Design a binder for this molecule. Structure first.
Ligand SMILES: [Mg+2]
Ligand SMILES: [Mg+2]
Ligand SMILES: [Mg+2]
Ligand SMILES: [Mg+2]
Ligand SMILES: [Mg+2]
Ligand SMILES: [Mg+2]
Ligand SMILES: [Mg+2]
Ligand SMILES: [Mg+2]
Ligand SMILES: [Mg+2]
Ligand SMILES: [Mg+2]
Ligand SMILES: [Mg+2]
Ligand SMILES: [Mg+2]
Ligand SMILES: [Mg+2]
Ligand SMILES: [Mg+2]
Ligand SMILES: [Mg+2]
Ligand SMILES: [Mg+2]
Ligand SMILES: [Mg+2]
Ligand SMILES: [Mg+2]
Ligand SMILES: [Mg+2]
Ligand SMILES: [Mg+2]
Ligand SMILES: [Mg+2]
Ligand SMILES: [Mg+2]
Ligand SMILES: [Mg+2]
Ligand SMILES: [Mg+2]
Ligand SMILES: [Mg+2]
Ligand SMILES: [Mg+2]
Ligand SMILES: [Mg+2]
Ligand SMILES: [Mg+2]
Ligand SMILES: [Mg+2]
Ligand SMILES: [Mg+2]
Ligand SMILES: [Mg+2]
Ligand SMILES: [Mg+2]
Ligand SMILES: [Mg+2]
Ligand SMILES: [Mg+2]
Ligand SMILES: [Mg+2]
Ligand SMILES: [Mg+2]
Ligand SMILES: [Mg+2]
Ligand SMILES: [Mg+2]
Ligand SMILES: [Mg+2]
Ligand SMILES: [Mg+2]
Ligand SMILES: [Mg+2]
Ligand SMILES: [Mg+2]
Ligand SMILES: [Mg+2]
Ligand SMILES: [Mg+2]
Ligand SMILES: [Mg+2]
Ligand SMILES: [Mg+2]
Ligand SMILES: [Mg+2]
Ligand SMILES: [Mg+2]
Ligand SMILES: [Mg+2]
Ligand SMILES: [Mg+2]
Ligand SMILES: [Mg+2]
Ligand SMILES: [Mg+2]
Ligand SMILES: [Mg+2]
Ligand SMILES: [Mg+2]
Ligand SMILES: [Mg+2]
Ligand SMILES: [Mg+2]
Ligand SMILES: [Mg+2]
Ligand SMILES: [Mg+2]
Ligand SMILES: [Mg+2]
Ligand SMILES: [Mg+2]
Ligand SMILES: [Mg+2]
Ligand SMILES: [Mg+2]
Ligand SMILES: [Mg+2]
Ligand SMILES: [Mg+2]
Ligand SMILES: [Mg+2]
Ligand SMILES: [Mg+2]
Ligand SMILES: [Mg+2]
Ligand SMILES: [Mg+2]
Ligand SMILES: [Mg+2]
Ligand SMILES: [Mg+2]
Ligand SMILES: [Mg+2]
Ligand SMILES: [Mg+2]
Ligand SMILES: [Mg+2]
Ligand SMILES: [Mg+2]
Ligand SMILES: [Mg+2]
Ligand SMILES: [Mg+2]
Ligand SMILES: [Mg+2]
Ligand SMILES: [Mg+2]
Ligand SMILES: [Mg+2]
Ligand SMILES: [Mg+2]
Ligand SMILES: [Mg+2]
Ligand SMILES: [Mg+2]
Ligand SMILES: [Mg+2]
Ligand SMILES: [Mg+2]
Ligand SMILES: [Mg+2]
Ligand SMILES: [Mg+2]
Ligand SMILES: [Mg+2]
Ligand SMILES: [Mg+2]
Ligand SMILES: [Mg+2]
Ligand SMILES: [Mg+2]
Ligand SMILES: [Mg+2]
Ligand SMILES: [Mg+2]
Ligand SMILES: [Mg+2]
Ligand SMILES: [Mg+2]
Ligand SMILES: [Mg+2]
Ligand SMILES: [Mg+2]
Ligand SMILES: [Mg+2]
Ligand SMILES: [Mg+2]
Ligand SMILES: [Mg+2]
Ligand SMILES: [Mg+2]
Ligand SMILES: [Mg+2]
Ligand SMILES: [Mg+2]
Ligand SMILES: [Mg+2]
Ligand SMILES: [Mg+2]
Ligand SMILES: [Mg+2]
Ligand SMILES: [Mg+2]
Ligand SMILES: [Mg+2]
Ligand SMILES: [Mg+2]
Ligand SMILES: [Mg+2]
Ligand SMILES: [Mg+2]
Ligand SMILES: [Mg+2]
Ligand SMILES: [Mg+2]
Ligand SMILES: [Mg+2]
Ligand SMILES: [Mg+2]
Ligand SMILES: [Mg+2]
Ligand SMILES: [Mg+2]
Ligand SMILES: [Mg+2]
Ligand SMILES: [Mg+2]
Ligand SMILES: [Mg+2]
Ligand SMILES: [Mg+2]
Ligand SMILES: [Mg+2]
Ligand SMILES: [Mg+2]
Ligand SMILES: [Mg+2]
Ligand SMILES: [Mg+2]
Ligand SMILES: [Mg+2]
Ligand SMILES: [Mg+2]
Ligand SMILES: [Mg+2]
Ligand SMILES: [Mg+2]
Ligand SMILES: [Mg+2]
Ligand SMILES: [Mg+2]
Ligand SMILES: [Mg+2]
Ligand SMILES: [Mg+2]
Ligand SMILES: [Mg+2]
Ligand SMILES: [Mg+2]
Ligand SMILES: [Mg+2]
Ligand SMILES: [Mg+2]
Ligand SMILES: [Mg+2]
Ligand SMILES: [Mg+2]
Ligand SMILES: [Mg+2]
Ligand SMILES: [Mg+2]
Ligand SMILES: [Mg+2]
Ligand SMILES: [Mg+2]
Ligand SMILES: [Mg+2]
Ligand SMILES: [Mg+2]
Ligand SMILES: [Mg+2]
Ligand SMILES: [Mg+2]
Ligand SMILES: [Mg+2]
Ligand SMILES: [Mg+2]
Ligand SMILES: [Mg+2]
Ligand SMILES: [Mg+2]
Ligand SMILES: [Mg+2]
Ligand SMILES: [Mg+2]
Ligand SMILES: [Mg+2]
Ligand SMILES: [Mg+2]
Ligand SMILES: [Mg+2]
Ligand SMILES: [Mg+2]
Ligand SMILES: [Mg+2]
Ligand SMILES: [Mg+2]
Ligand SMILES: [Mg+2]
Ligand SMILES: [Mg+2]
Ligand SMILES: [Mg+2]
Ligand SMILES: [Mg+2]
Ligand SMILES: [Mg+2]
Ligand SMILES: [Mg+2]
Ligand SMILES: [Mg+2]
Ligand SMILES: [Mg+2]
Ligand SMILES: [Mg+2]
Ligand SMILES: [Mg+2]
Ligand SMILES: [Mg+2]
Ligand SMILES: [Mg+2]
Ligand SMILES: [Mg+2]
Ligand SMILES: [Mg+2]
Ligand SMILES: [Mg+2]
Ligand SMILES: [Mg+2]
Ligand SMILES: [Mg+2]
Ligand SMILES: [Mg+2]
Ligand SMILES: [Mg+2]
Ligand SMILES: [Mg+2]
Ligand SMILES: [Mg+2]
Ligand SMILES: [Mg+2]
Ligand SMILES: [Mg+2]
Ligand SMILES: [Mg+2]
Ligand SMILES: [Mg+2]
Ligand SMILES: [Mg+2]
Ligand SMILES: [Mg+2]
Ligand SMILES: [Mg+2]
Ligand SMILES: [Mg+2]
Ligand SMILES: [Mg+2]
Ligand SMILES: [Mg+2]
Ligand SMILES: [Mg+2]
Ligand SMILES: [Mg+2]
Ligand SMILES: [Mg+2]
Ligand SMILES: [Mg+2]
Ligand SMILES: [Mg+2]
Ligand SMILES: [Mg+2]
Ligand SMILES: [Mg+2]
Ligand SMILES: [Mg+2]
Ligand SMILES: [Mg+2]
Ligand SMILES: [Mg+2]
Ligand SMILES: [Mg+2]
Ligand SMILES: [Mg+2]
Ligand SMILES: [Mg+2]
Ligand SMILES: [Mg+2]
Ligand SMILES: [Mg+2]
Ligand SMILES: [Mg+2]
Ligand SMILES: [Mg+2]
Ligand SMILES: [Mg+2]
Ligand SMILES: [Mg+2]
Ligand SMILES: [Mg+2]
Ligand SMILES: [Mg+2]
Ligand SMILES: [Mg+2]
Ligand SMILES: [Mg+2]
Ligand SMILES: [Mg+2]
Ligand SMILES: [Mg+2]
Ligand SMILES: [Mg+2]
Ligand SMILES: [Mg+2]
Ligand SMILES: [Mg+2]
Ligand SMILES: [Mg+2]
Ligand SMILES: [Mg+2]
Ligand SMILES: [Mg+2]
Ligand SMILES: [Mg+2]
Ligand SMILES: [Mg+2]
Ligand SMILES: [Mg+2]
Ligand SMILES: [Mg+2]
Ligand SMILES: [Mg+2]
Ligand SMILES: [Mg+2]
Ligand SMILES: [Mg+2]
Ligand SMILES: [Mg+2]
Ligand SMILES: [Mg+2]
Ligand SMILES: [Mg+2]
Ligand SMILES: [Mg+2]
Ligand SMILES: [Mg+2]
Ligand SMILES: [Mg+2]
Ligand SMILES: [Mg+2]
Ligand SMILES: [Mg+2]
Ligand SMILES: [Mg+2]
Ligand SMILES: [Mg+2]
Ligand SMILES: [Mg+2]
Ligand SMILES: [Mg+2]
Ligand SMILES: [Mg+2]
Lengths: 64, 149, 202, 59
RNA sequence: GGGCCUGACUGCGAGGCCUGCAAGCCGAGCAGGGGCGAAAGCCGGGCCUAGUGAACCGGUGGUCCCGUGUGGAAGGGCCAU
RNA sequence: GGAUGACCCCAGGCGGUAGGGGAGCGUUCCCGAUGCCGAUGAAGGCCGACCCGCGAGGGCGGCUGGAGGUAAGGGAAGUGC
RNA sequence: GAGGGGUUGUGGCGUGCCUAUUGAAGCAUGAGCCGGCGACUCACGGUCGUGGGCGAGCUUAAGCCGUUGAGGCGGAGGCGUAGGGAAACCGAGUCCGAACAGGGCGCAGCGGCCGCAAAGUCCGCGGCCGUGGACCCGAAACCGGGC
RNA sequence: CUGUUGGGAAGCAGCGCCAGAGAGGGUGAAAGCCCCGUAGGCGAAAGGUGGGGGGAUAGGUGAGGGUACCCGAGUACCCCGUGGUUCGUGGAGCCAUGGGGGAAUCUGGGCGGACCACCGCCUAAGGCUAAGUACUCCGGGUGACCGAUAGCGCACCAGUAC
RNA sequence: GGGGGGAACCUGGGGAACUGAAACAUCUCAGUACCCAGAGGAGAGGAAAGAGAAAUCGACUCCCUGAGUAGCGGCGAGCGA
């Protein structure tokens, strides 16, 4: 049978044009009142996952 | 040329790695598997693309983001695939999404949009949309843009 | 442009023909592999421990008999049990790229051209469906019988005649395939067949 | 494609209308170069002042 | 100790420390509108190093992005919590 | 060096479990084969102090056996205890 | 029949095999001996590498025709040709933002138009991954319908 | 066909012949021409089949005008409990229905993913319907299928002996 | 006229658990195994109170594709039009 796309990944992650894996920053879902705006602000951005982890999530997305 | 003269190139048909066939091969006994544990078992090892020994996985600790959709599923709306002025120099006279579909440039059931990367040709170009840059190069290289619905 | 010799009722003339200049011996191998592979029947079969006719009883208890531990006698470690990775019915066919086989068909014919072993004919004289009748024609045509021949013609009478000599493979032109072109030492064709051949390699 | 136009011969002594065609193309100086479109209008002015002009085709 | 104040900013962030990951940390300078200062400047909480919890699921205030024939709505998304 | 393994010289490396790579031998089958070996003796068996190969192995010869076997070069695996 | 084969008196040296282990001749595991059976495979999908075809294109699936160990047709569809954005949307850009700021993620062959090469894609081959019992043998057990 | 070697020729040698047949198996060893076959042809009084050719029957058939008679009931519909669908209570429609309530006959009713309007699609609560699809006890054809520990459990008096 | 039989195949009526989720309960295995009733050479389905956005299509079955898409999911394992 053909492989199935991992729907947990596809809802958290996007493969870029060269093939980096990019997600949202962790750490601002709650408990934000005493966080400096620089934390709130920098975590509202996207980052590139480290290459080892980046290439496991990519295998979970064989049809993109 | 005879039949017996037919052979492949070198490397065209490599032989396989037969394990478990004895000492002098390199893969005797444990068949390159090491000693004990999972993985060395028939069927062993959880999907190592995903599994991390029980702790919460690198994937699952990342947050979700975006519209996922909901039943009854995705919403049918017009969709556009763009084609550049460079991807038009091969033609003469007119260009329409039908002719662009035969070429292997536009995908069926997609509306046409012209994008501005490349040289503009004096072509009469029927399309569903044009980028501002694609319009300027076109309406200023001798060609006729035909916007349609 | 190779110069193919044409046999005629009105004289050995010649006829310029455009076949591939250089042959790719690996490509002709790739076509022949695929021909000989998609014809494989794929009917080797064995039975798995689950497909074998014994029952699933545990033959003796797990512990305390002093013998080995076993389960059912269908296990492949038993004589008469299942076989582990025995063959099952397989489809060995695969879609060799069209352009590849189209190329191999032109390159295989080209090799015989680049050898003086390709000979085109307009018709076959006193041959109307009898093996003697073809035999005579083959004598007048140089084709004594000291060399294997592919006979490519849409004339069934001609085909019926030669198809039984050990040194002759007969074919309708729609059947032209590189394996048979390689199998044989020479190659004879109709201008009706040459005309078709030109159609297919374009 | 485009048009790389070199003006190599002075308009001096040529008709007033040939002199204005130069000015339409934006060519005002000897050994000056303007890359233009290939509009039949733009081309005709290049074809009118053909004898004073050397033309490369780009794109 | 005092006087005026709210930078316990908003939009970004070169470059680093630390580091298996994910985190954690430090950060010049730019723009918006400011506080204090004659000014040089300083200010994106606290002498520093503990006072904390990924994601999932939901709540609330915005935004007006999607809205299953069409306009709306239901429900989501995004920003903040 | 000569000229792309055309072979010769010179120099240096070559303990090894897990494991990574490389080059080969052998087994059954297919094309090669309407061929070719074969009763003046096939396959298999028993010997061998003989030949080739680093080796796995391949020859050769004598006995047994009495009807099969199968090349160069490729192809596929129920392929080596 | 200047050698070799058999045998072995004496001298010298010498702790079986496999498995498991930091470490076994080990007084740790397995094996009486012999012959035969006995364990890393296949499908589809993936990801690399590699051998070829074509190359901004590559390729068909089911079928239909043909063959009767003959190939062909079929372009539906799939991958590629553009990305950025949750999306609307814009597009060689785009997103955050008040910004023409900063930033994230993106955007450009070799020799004389010929010749070679290449994105890519197709098929073969090989390593490895996913799904399947997935290297083979082995439970104690759970469940169903019967005896 | 003959000669030769041999227990035996189909081997080897000589001179031929057939081929729409040179697939394959036999025959004392290796046979196109010895045998059984093969290529190509022919065949059914009787039973079964007959989806194809023909015939027969059943059957099928208008146009405006008025009338508002009919158009499938414990049904639609709604609320409760569930199942089905990719849909796990979700914004949860659709299809089905165990319980309660309970219509209308085209100006009727159902659907287009809560609901409302608009615009459309369709005519529920009666039934039947080839073909293309599945399977292999059975028969035949073919294997880069097994070759007696293999291949079915059984090549043999095997679902037997025990 | 029924009754009973038939290797698989079919429909309907009932309907598990191991296992997977590296524990487990929703979920998974799976409407699978099995039981029962019935049908045949096939069975089911079938002539729109359909689809669903095409101002469109036109019974049903079956294959390829669409597509591991849309979505479903202790948004876990997975499930999947
Ligand atoms: Mg599956
Ligand atoms: Mg995303
Ligand atoms: Mg959280
Ligand atoms: Mg938030
Ligand atoms: Mg808080
Ligand atoms: Mg703080
Ligand atoms: Mg702050
Ligand atoms: Mg704050
Ligand atoms: Mg911070
Ligand atoms: Mg912000
Ligand atoms: Mg991947
Ligand atoms: Mg993948
Ligand atoms: Mg896809
Ligand atoms: Mg191989
Ligand atoms: Mg292998
Ligand atoms: Mg190897
Ligand atoms: Mg050994
Ligand atoms: Mg070995
Ligand atoms: Mg190795
Ligand atoms: Mg080793
Ligand atoms: Mg090993
Ligand atoms: Mg061992
Ligand atoms: Mg092991
Ligand atoms: Mg290994
Ligand atoms: Mg390996
Ligand atoms: Mg291992
Ligand atoms: Mg391994
Ligand atoms: Mg081990
Ligand atoms: Mg160990
Ligand atoms: Mg270990
Ligand atoms: Mg071990
Ligand atoms: Mg260990
Ligand atoms: Mg271990
Ligand atoms: Mg262990
Ligand atoms: Mg290990
Ligand atoms: Mg492994
Ligand atoms: Mg590992
Ligand atoms: Mg598993
Ligand atoms: Mg396991
Ligand atoms: Mg834990
Ligand atoms: Mg989506
Ligand atoms: Mg079998
Ligand atoms: Mg078996
Ligand atoms: Mg078994
Ligand atoms: Mg089984
Ligand atoms: Mg069983
Ligand atoms: Mg059984
Ligand atoms: Mg039994
Ligand atoms: Mg059993
Ligand atoms: Mg049991
Ligand atoms: Mg049992
Ligand atoms: Mg015991
Ligand atoms: Mg004992
Ligand atoms: Mg025992
Ligand atoms: Mg025993
Ligand atoms: Mg036991
Ligand atoms: Mg057993
Ligand atoms: Mg027994
Ligand atoms: Mg057996
Ligand atoms: Mg087994
Ligand atoms: Mg197995
Ligand atoms: Mg394969
Ligand atoms: Mg023949
Ligand atoms: Mg022949
Ligand atoms: Mg031949
Ligand atoms: Mg032949
Ligand atoms: Mg034939
Ligand atoms: Mg023929
Ligand atoms: Mg033929
Ligand atoms: Mg030849
Ligand atoms: Mg002048
Ligand atoms: Mg003047
Ligand atoms: Mg002058
Ligand atoms: Mg004038
Ligand atoms: Mg104070
Ligand atoms: Mg003030
Ligand atoms: Mg940085
Ligand atoms: Mg880091
Ligand atoms: Mg900290
Ligand atoms: Mg300022
Ligand atoms: Mg200031
Ligand atoms: Mg002041
Ligand atoms: Mg100042
Ligand atoms: Mg600052
Ligand atoms: Mg959870
Ligand atoms: Mg939330
Ligand atoms: Mg939420
Ligand atoms: Mg609100
Ligand atoms: Mg809107
Ligand atoms: Mg709106
Ligand atoms: Mg709407
Ligand atoms: Mg309104
Ligand atoms: Mg909202
Ligand atoms: Mg909400
Ligand atoms: Mg050296
Ligand atoms: Mg040396
Ligand atoms: Mg050394
Ligand atoms: Mg070594
Ligand atoms: Mg060594
Ligand atoms: Mg065989
Ligand atoms: Mg043969
Ligand atoms: Mg002989
Ligand atoms: Mg003899
Ligand atoms: Mg043999
Ligand atoms: Mg021998
Ligand atoms: Mg050696
Ligand atoms: Mg030997
Ligand atoms: Mg002898
Ligand atoms: Mg012998
Ligand atoms: Mg024989
Ligand atoms: Mg042999
Ligand atoms: Mg062989
Ligand atoms: Mg060989
Ligand atoms: Mg294989
Ligand atoms: Mg085996
Ligand atoms: Mg091998
Ligand atoms: Mg061995
Ligand atoms: Mg001696
Ligand atoms: Mg001695
Ligand atoms: Mg003595
Ligand atoms: Mg001694
Ligand atoms: Mg001793
Ligand atoms: Mg001693
Ligand atoms: Mg040993
Ligand atoms: Mg042991
Ligand atoms: Mg141990
Ligand atoms: Mg121990
Ligand atoms: Mg002891
Ligand atoms: Mg002892
Ligand atoms: Mg002990
Ligand atoms: Mg011991
Ligand atoms: Mg132990
Ligand atoms: Mg013992
Ligand atoms: Mg014993
Ligand atoms: Mg014993
Ligand atoms: Mg013994
Ligand atoms: Mg043994
Ligand atoms: Mg393997
Ligand atoms: Mg297998
Ligand atoms: Mg594969
Ligand atoms: Mg693959
Ligand atoms: Mg692969
Ligand atoms: Mg090609
Ligand atoms: Mg094509
Ligand atoms: Mg995107
Ligand atoms: Mg904005
Ligand atoms: Mg910017
Ligand atoms: Mg930018
Ligand atoms: Mg090329
Ligand atoms: Mg390629
Ligand atoms: Mg891998
Ligand atoms: Mg299993
Ligand atoms: Mg399985
Ligand atoms: Mg197992
Ligand atoms: Mg495996
Ligand atoms: Mg249980
Ligand atoms: Mg129990
Ligand atoms: Mg229990
Ligand atoms: Mg019971
Ligand atoms: Mg005699
Ligand atoms: Mg005779
Ligand atoms: Mg003779
Ligand atoms: Mg024949
Ligand atoms: Mg036959
Ligand atoms: Mg024969
Ligand atoms: Mg014969
Ligand atoms: Mg015979
Ligand atoms: Mg005899
Ligand atoms: Mg013979
Ligand atoms: Mg023979
Ligand atoms: Mg014969
Ligand atoms: Mg016949
Ligand atoms: Mg007959
Ligand atoms: Mg007949
Ligand atoms: Mg009729
Ligand atoms: Mg009527
Ligand atoms: Mg009624
Ligand atoms: Mg009711
Ligand atoms: Mg309703
Ligand atoms: Mg209630
Ligand atoms: Mg309800
Ligand atoms: Mg469902
Ligand atoms: Mg459905
Ligand atoms: Mg439900
Ligand atoms: Mg469900
Ligand atoms: Mg629902
Ligand atoms: Mg429901
Ligand atoms: Mg309803
Ligand atoms: Mg009425
Ligand atoms: Mg109405
Ligand atoms: Mg009404
Ligand atoms: Mg309804
Ligand atoms: Mg409704
Ligand atoms: Mg509807
Ligand atoms: Mg609606
Ligand atoms: Mg209406
Ligand atoms: Mg409808
Ligand atoms: Mg009605
Ligand atoms: Mg009805
Ligand atoms: Mg029916
Ligand atoms: Mg039917
Ligand atoms: Mg049969
Ligand atoms: Mg049979
Ligand atoms: Mg055999
Ligand atoms: Mg026996
Ligand atoms: Mg047996
Ligand atoms: Mg025997
Ligand atoms: Mg056997
Ligand atoms: Mg039997
Ligand atoms: Mg039987
Ligand atoms: Mg038996
Ligand atoms: Mg008996
Ligand atoms: Mg009964
Ligand atoms: Mg019955
Ligand atoms: Mg059933
Ligand atoms: Mg049922
Ligand atoms: Mg029960
Ligand atoms: Mg369970
Ligand atoms: Mg359980
Ligand atoms: Mg579990
Ligand atoms: Mg577990
Ligand atoms: Mg447990
Ligand atoms: Mg459970
Ligand atoms: Mg459940
Ligand atoms: Mg299962
Ligand atoms: Mg289920
Ligand atoms: Mg059911
Ligand atoms: Mg049928
Ligand atoms: Mg039927
Ligand atoms: Mg009706
Ligand atoms: Mg009706
Ligand atoms: Mg419908
Ligand atoms: Mg319509
Ligand atoms: Mg209708
Ligand atoms: Mg489908
Ligand atoms: Mg698609
Ligand atoms: Mg689900
Ligand atoms: Mg999720
Ligand atoms: Mg699931
Ligand atoms: Mg399910």
């Amino acid at each position: 049978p053909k492989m199935k796309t991992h729907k947990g990944a596809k809802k958290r992650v996007k493969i870029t044009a060269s093939g980096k894996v990019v997600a949202m920053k962790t750490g601002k879902r709650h408990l934000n009142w005493q966080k400096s705006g620089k934390e709130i602000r920098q975590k509202g951005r996207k980052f590139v996952l480290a290459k080892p982890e980046a290439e496991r999530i990519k295998l979970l997305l064989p049809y993109e | 040329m005879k039949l017996s003269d037919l052979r492949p190139n070198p490397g065209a048909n490599k032989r396989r790695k037969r394990v478990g066939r004895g000492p002098g091969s390199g893969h005797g006994k444990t068949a390159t598997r090491g000693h004990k544990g999972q993985k060395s078992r028939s069927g062993g090892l959880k999907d190592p693309r995903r599994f991390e020994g029980g702790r919460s996985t690198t994937l699952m600790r990342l947050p979700k983001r975006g519209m996922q959709g909901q039943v009854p599923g995705e919403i049918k709306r017009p969709r556009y695939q763009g084609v550049n002025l460079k991807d038009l120099a091969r033609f003469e006279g007119e260009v329409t999404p039908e002719l662009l579909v035969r070429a292997g440039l536009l995908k069926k059931g997609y509306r046409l949009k012209i994008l501005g990367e490349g040289e503009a040709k004096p072509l009469k170009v029927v399309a569903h949309a044009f980028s501002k840059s694609a319009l300027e190069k076109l309406k200023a290289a001798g060609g006729e843009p035909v916007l349609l619905e | 442009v190779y110069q193919i010799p044409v046999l005629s009722p009105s004289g050995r003339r010649e006829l310029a023909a455009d076949l591939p200049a250089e042959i790719n011996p690996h490509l002709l191998w790739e076509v022949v592999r695929w021909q000989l592979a998609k014809r494989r029947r794929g009917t080797a079969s064995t039975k798995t421990r689950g497909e074998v006719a014994y029952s699933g009883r545990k033959i003796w208890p797990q512990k305390h008999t002093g013998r080995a531990r076993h389960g059912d006698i269908g296990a492949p470690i038993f004589v008469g049990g299942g076989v582990v990775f025995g063959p099952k019915p397989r489809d060995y066919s695969y879609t060799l790229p069209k352009k590849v086989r189209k190329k191999g068909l032109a390159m295989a014919v080209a090799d015989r051209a680049r050898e003086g072993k390709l000979l085109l004919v307009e018709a076959f004289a006193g041959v109307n469906g009898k093996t003697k009748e073809f035999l005579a024609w083959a004598k007048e045509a140089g084709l004594d019988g000291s060399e294997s021949v592919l006979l490519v013609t849409g004339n069934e009478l001609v085909r019926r005649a030669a198809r039984n000599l050990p040194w002759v493979v007969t074919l309708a032109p729609e059947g032209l395939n590189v394996y048979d072109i390689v199998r044989t030492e020479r190659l004879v064709m109709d201008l009706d067949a040459w005309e078709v051949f030109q159609n297919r390699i374009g | 494609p485009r048009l790389k136009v070199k003006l190599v011969k002075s308009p001096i002594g040529y008709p007033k209308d040939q002199k204005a065609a130069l000015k339409a193309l934006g060519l005002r100086r000897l050994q000056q170069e303007r890359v233009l479109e290939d509009t039949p209008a733009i081309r005709g002015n290049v074809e009118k002042v053909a004898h004073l002009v050397r033309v490369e085709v780009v794109e």
